[PDB]
RNA sequence: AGGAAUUCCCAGUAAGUGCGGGUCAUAAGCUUGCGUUGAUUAAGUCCCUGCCCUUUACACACCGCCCGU
């Protein structure tokens, strides 16, 4: 599966239960204009681009 | 699915205030993927007339 | 390419009785552990004695391919020598053991370089980098041939345990294997282990 | 004017192959200095050290690393040596190819760690840009410090080769090793 | 400057100096054939080991080891572009080096005897051709894994020698010296004798037209190209067994069978 | 088919000290080992012990493929139960022989079942009939293929020396093998041969 | 080149190096000044271990009753 590309919309907040990770909303490079929920470890801020080399699995899920 | 039931809830009159909040709001986070899919046509043309004729 | 044998939740430790000090043995001591409640049983020296005759007069410790490590259940990281030979008889690798759990080192007495020393915790520091780590067990419902699983110039860790009842579980393996239908002890293990190595690594 | 890293390294033909990384790595026109020697005030603020020189940055994280600390001229002619061993042994631009080593280096997704006293268990998460060129830098100098220890072999050469191998690509490298094994645990603990 | 190898050490002289201004002694037992890179900063040596070392200039230890050989090696080179070497030793096979990546890019098995006499071209990268005391000059070169060109000398080969205009190869062998035209393959224009013994080195002026050779019995012969007839000669107290050029013909350095 | 194994010159035997009976250890009895000038050293009860355990906890001996037999350095020849267990700890083991060798016999404590007993001398009456006998021991220059010598449907002696010091030699041996060029341990000869065994018999 | 445990630490900070004074208390193999060189990581949560408080100024907007003995 190819290696995606995102872009940090919206930083939520500090996940707390999952070590200190942040949640991040981010959207695809692409023009499909799809937007996911993901979890980043590390020093992060609005209009940082993230590197997925999978994409289909979610943060928060059943 | 939340598109559909939320069509369900304006009919009824039941809480519109509540539920147009929150509809209106995932409209406005998932405007592009929204108009991508082919298949939610039918779901806001139910949702056009239902909305502004309850409010 | 080398081989990590890591001896995992060894019974190794130190009591007093009299004037004297001396390893905790299960049948000597049997008094000294009912006192305090402590369970009968469980100090096994023997297990990680017998498997440290299996590992050491293994021809691929021989040539020189083999690295023993042994972490105890009270958290004390040991590292072993190759050039060192094991006691045979129990009774003076008690001496060993209780003479290096004091000191924290034990010298060779025809060499100047240590044989048995203390380190420091965890022993995930002291693994090459890039080598795979593999835990034993018998509850996994496929065996593994241990033949296909060597690596042709890469260095592995494996994990034995030094327990006669409880499964292997550290932070550091990514799988569990099998080896066998059957449960087999801890010494027949590393026997076993070692010597599918050397026919891969042409030791004959 | 052309600035010129030492007076002979230039660096407009450097280039980032990497676009997630463009905005962390200081090489371009505005951040030329002759020296990796600004003494400026760049850990003062968040987020604020991603406008220092990579070159700086790597002449800081090699002082902590088997030294005495507050050494820098010293590691600034360490760097140097390395850099003149790079151009001698490869033939190309250093710069590029420190630039390629922070970029093959870096891994992508880490595992945060849920951690309790009996085990551990597991979750893979994403890397941001900025932890991922403080650790591939950090994997290069303790590459470097750890091979050469113990070996009849001064610090340059052994660097140089460190970046050598990781810019390659090449298994040869500790960055690379560390970087593959984290991936390879993130990656089974989906 | 000039490096002179003896025994198991390579000593860096300079002009006068009669102290050597820089010395590598870590050798095992000798070292052969050390040779200056084309922007002086590196040199190639040789062991009776095996192993290719290259040398800084200026440090103590070598920076780059190659274990490919298994006995003794006497020739080694650069090519044309300076991030390659050619080694030749006494396993009768020739093996091509890459310096970057420490490996050996290439090998080639094709000599029945001691190979102990390499040189490369500095117009064309991999074209380089080696000599052995097979009797026979084979030239490993194009981008192939077989020589596509051979050449049969009636004495063990000493020393080759490559003119960089006109593709012209000189052989010295025993008291012959012979030169071999590559624009039809194999073409002997001049073979020469003017020595009573051996001739041990052969050496090209920074002038095409002058050729200096160097044998064992106390003698030098230069000769012009054009006529290919002998124009100077020089006498010395002993055997020449390495003569050197600098720059122009500003130092004239020869080294003899004593030390 | 079934492989039978005889370890000869074991070093077993019950010595007097005070009013109690104890198996002669080296380390415990070095005083009166000292007296009457016999050898210290000798006395190796604890090759015996690691050996029978891995035999006795070998894959094939749960299969009912393996026979061991002991035939000491005092002309005692001894059979084991196939069913029989082995303590790990060397103390408890000793008991068993020492009131093995007074009473002849060892019995089951939860059955009439016949475990442990001394039978008579020579053991090659005992040996079924077709069967082949190879003696082991490291000084055969030529190394023999440990899979090679298995017989398909035949059963086969093996000869492993117990003691010390020596070389194997017995009359009804008809063959002399090695099965590395290293000096093994008795233990770990044991752990080769039934391990080769093991795969050409089928049993995983 | 110093195990198990355990203590401390966020910018001229950690760490290294030298040079003085003995000041109405204290301080001698110790105490206190002054200068030189100068870093890695972090700028956010209540998950563990705890602490401090609360659950009766009517712009717009928002919101619409803690419980028990
Ligand atoms: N069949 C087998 N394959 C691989 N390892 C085995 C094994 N049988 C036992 N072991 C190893 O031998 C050690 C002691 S034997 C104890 C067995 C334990 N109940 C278990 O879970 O396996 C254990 O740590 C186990 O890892
Ligand atoms: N490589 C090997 N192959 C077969 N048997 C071996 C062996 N190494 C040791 N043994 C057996 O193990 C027993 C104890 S080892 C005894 C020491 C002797 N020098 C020796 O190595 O053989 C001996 O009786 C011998 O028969
Ligand atoms: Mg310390
Ligand atoms: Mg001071």
Redesign the interface.
């Given at each position: 599966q190819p290696i995606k590309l995102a872009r940090v919309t919206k930083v939520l907040g500090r996940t707390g239960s999952q070590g200190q990770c942040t949640q991040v909303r981010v959207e695809f490079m692409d023009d499909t204009s799809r937007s996911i929920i993901r979890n980043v470890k590390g020093p992060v801020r609005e209009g940082d681009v993230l590197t997925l080399l999978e994409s289909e699995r979610e943060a928060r899920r059943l | 699915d939340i598109l559909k039931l939320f069509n369900e809830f304006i009919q009824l009159g039941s809480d519109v205030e509540l539920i147009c909040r929150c509809l209106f709001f995932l409209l406005r986070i998932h405007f592009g993927q929204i108009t991508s899919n082919q298949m939610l046509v039918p779901v806001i043309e139910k949702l056009r007339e239902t909305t502004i004729s309850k409010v | 390419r080398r081989l990590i044998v890591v001896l995992e939740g060894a019974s190794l430790e130190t009591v007093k009785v009299g004037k004297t000090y001396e390893l905790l043995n299960?049948?000597?001591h049997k008094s000294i552990l009912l006192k305090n409640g402590r369970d009968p049983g469980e100090a096994?020296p023997?297990?990680t004695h017998?498997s440290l005759?299996?590992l050491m007069?293994?021809?691929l410790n021989?040539a020189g391919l083999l690295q023993v490590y042994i972490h105890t259940q009270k958290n004390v990281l040991i590292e072993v020598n190759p050039q060192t030979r094991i006691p045979?008889?129990?009774?003076?690798f008690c001496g060993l053991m209780v003479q290096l759990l004091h000191k924290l080192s034990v010298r060779a007495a025809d060499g100047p370089q240590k044989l048995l020393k203390v380190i420091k915790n965890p022993v995930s520091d002291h693994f090459p980098?890039?080598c795979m780590k593999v835990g034993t067990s018998f509850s996994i419902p496929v065996?593994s041939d241990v033949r296909e699983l060597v690596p042709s110039s890469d260095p592995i860790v494996f994990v034995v345990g030094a327990f006669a009842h409880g499964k292997v579980?550290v932070?550091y393996t990514?799988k569990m294997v099998s080896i066998?239908?059957?449960p087999?002890?801890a010494?027949?293990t590393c026997?076993?282990l070692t010597?599918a190595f050397e026919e891969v690594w042409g030791v004959? | 004017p052309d600035i010129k890293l030492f007076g002979k390294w230039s660096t407009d033909d450097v280039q980032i192959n990497d676009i997630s990384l463009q905005d962390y790595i200081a090489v371009k026109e505005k951040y030329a200095k002759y020296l990796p020697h600004s003494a400026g005030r760049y850990a003062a603020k968040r987020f604020r050290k991603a406008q220092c020189p990579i070159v700086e940055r790597l002449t800081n994280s090699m002082m902590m690393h088997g030294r005495n600390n507050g050494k820098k001229l010293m590691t600034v002619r360490i760097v140097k040596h390395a850099f003149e061993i790079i151009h001698l042994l490869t033939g190309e631009n250093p710069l590029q190819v420190l630039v390629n080593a922070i970029i093959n280096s870096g891994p992508r997704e880490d595992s945060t760690r849920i951690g309790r006293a009996?085990?551990?268990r597991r979750q893979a998460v994403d890397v941001s840009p900025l932890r991922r060129v403080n650790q591939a830098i950090w994997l290069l100098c303790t590459g470097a410090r750890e091979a050469a220890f113990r070996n009849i072999k001064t610090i340059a050469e052994c660097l140089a080769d460190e970046l050598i191998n990781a810019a390659k690509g090449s298994?040869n490298s500790?960055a690379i090793?560390?970087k593959?094994?984290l991936e390879?645990?993130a990656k089974?603990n989906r | 400057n000039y490096a002179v190898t003896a025994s198991s050490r390579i000593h860096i002289y300079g002009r006068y100096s009669q102290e050597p201004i820089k010395t590598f002694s870590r050798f095992k037992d000798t070292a052969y054939c050390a040779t200056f890179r084309q922007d002086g900063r590196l040199l190639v040596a040789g062991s009776e080991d095996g192993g290719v070392q290259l040398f800084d200039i200026s440090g103590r230890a070598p920076l780059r080891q190659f274990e490919g050989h298994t006995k003794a090696v006497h020739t080694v080179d650069f090519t044309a572009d300076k991030y390659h070497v050619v080694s030749g030793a006494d396993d009768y096979t020739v093996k091509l080096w890459d310096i970057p990546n420490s490996k050996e890019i290439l090998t080639f098995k094709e000599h029945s005897d001691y190979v102990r006499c390499g040189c490369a071209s500095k117009l064309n990268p991999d074209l380089f051709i080696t000599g052995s005391y097979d009797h026979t000059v084979k030239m490993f070169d194009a981008r192939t894994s077989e020589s596509v060109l051979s050449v049969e000398h009636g004495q063990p080969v000493e020393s080759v020698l490559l003119f960089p205009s006109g593709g012209l190869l000189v052989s010295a062998g025993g008291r012959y010296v012979k030169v071999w035209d590559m624009l039809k393959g194999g073409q002997l224009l001049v073979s020469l004798k003017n020595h009573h013994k051996t001739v041990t080195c052969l050496c090209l002026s920074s002038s095409g037209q002058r050729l200096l050779s160097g044998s064992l019995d106390r003698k030098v012969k230069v000769y012009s190209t054009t006529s290919y007839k002998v124009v100077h000669s020089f006498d010395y107290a002993a055997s020449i067994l390495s003569l050197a050029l600098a720059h122009e013909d500003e130092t004239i350095v020869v080294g003899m069978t004593n030390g």
């Open positions: - | - | 299960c049948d000597k096994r023997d297990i017998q005759l299996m007069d293994s021809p021989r045979r008889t129990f009774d003076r980098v890039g065996v579980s932070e990514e066998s239908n059957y087999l002890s010494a027949l026997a076993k010597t004959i | 009996g085990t551990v298994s500790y090793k560390k593959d094994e390879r645990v089974s | -």
